[PDB]
């Protein structure tokens, strides 16, 4: 697919893609190295990140974002922006006078890289905290676990 759907050229800023080509420099292939990094904390770089072609500067694996801070989990509830999803974290808040709990939830707008295709509503996502990416986004989707019902 064409990765150049923007008014400006999309590229990985750390990759030089027009190193000089000559007869010896080209033998039936142009070649294009792919910048990717191994984020920490045991998270493995998805295969599509390594062998993909998308340009996403907020992607944890091939972009310019450092995963540091809280590592949370949520359930995907809305996928209707570009490269951003809304997940819902459900918890119980303890009211002490009644010695009981009440259901509460918080929505979280988190960045989803193009490396995670086939993400559905109800999927569980492990997200990691990064620097502010937009007005409301501060977490990047690190891992996707499909909801029970995969067959």
């Amino acid at each position: 697919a064409d990765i150049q759907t923007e008014r400006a050229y999309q590229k990985q800023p750390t990759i030089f893609q027009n190193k000089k080509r000559v007869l010896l420099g080209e033998t039936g292939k142009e070649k294009l190295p792919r910048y990717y990094k191994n984020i920490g904390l045991g998270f493995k770089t998805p295969k599509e990140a390594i062998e993909g072609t998308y340009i996403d500067k907020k992607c944890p694996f091939t972009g310019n974002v450092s995963i540091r801070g809280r590592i949370l989990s949520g359930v995907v509830t809305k996928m209707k922006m570009q490269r951003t999803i809304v997940i819902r974290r459900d918890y119980l808040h303890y009211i002490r006078k009644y010695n009981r709990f009440e259901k509460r939830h918080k929505n979280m707008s988190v960045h989803l890289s193009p490396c995670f295709r086939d993400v559905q509503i109800g999927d569980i996502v492990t997200v990691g905290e990064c620097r502010p990416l937009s007005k409301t986004v501060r977490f990047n989707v690190l891992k996707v676990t499909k909801a029970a019902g995969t067959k």
Partner: protein, 262 residues
Amino acid sequence: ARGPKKHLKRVAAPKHWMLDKLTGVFAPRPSTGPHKLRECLPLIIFLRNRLKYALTGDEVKKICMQRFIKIDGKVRTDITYPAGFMDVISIDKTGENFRLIYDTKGRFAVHRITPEEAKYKLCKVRKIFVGTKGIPHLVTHDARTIRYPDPLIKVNDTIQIDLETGKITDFIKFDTGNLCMVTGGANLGRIGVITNRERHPGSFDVVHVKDANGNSFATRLSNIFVIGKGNKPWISLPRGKGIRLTIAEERDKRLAAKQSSG
């Protein structure tokens, strides 16, 4: 507030200074220096409250301005100078030397050391980095920078600085079986052998320490200071050797001392 603060309230001061709640509204705000505000001991507190060499801050000022106090071998005339862990305070007029070392209660002790021990100190290396044509540099807990350190010295180790020259003479690795003091937290002032280190990536590592009396405790890796190689300290320890007694044992010792004394 605009700009930095320049005052410290008496009640908001660090508790281990052991200041009253009636001898004024303010506590001496320690100057910026090699040690943090809440982990230091100002020179006025040491000279007046601890050693009783002065009865007022004016007398501390007189003592310090007569150039009688050396801190790590250098004369300090700043009465709010932040003196901290492992530092050496020399008073050549009275011919004494002290090391700033925590009690088991978490308070800096009046720990007199020999004039030959006052020639060196121990520093925990806070970071190591290569700069400017590949010269290695090391930064310790005294905020002092040492160029060309041994390529075996890493973060969390301990190095013995010669105060006269400022150069490294020896070093202790951070490893199990090594003696260490605790320099923060609930176990502050305790001494023991490192038994384990739980690595928590992206968070604080936890180090387990076993006392000389079989007691065990844990701290954060930033609260550990390697004191000696093996179970032999490289510095003289205070009266209590880092053994935190329970309240019952302390009461029993106090009662025995009362019986022996009166």
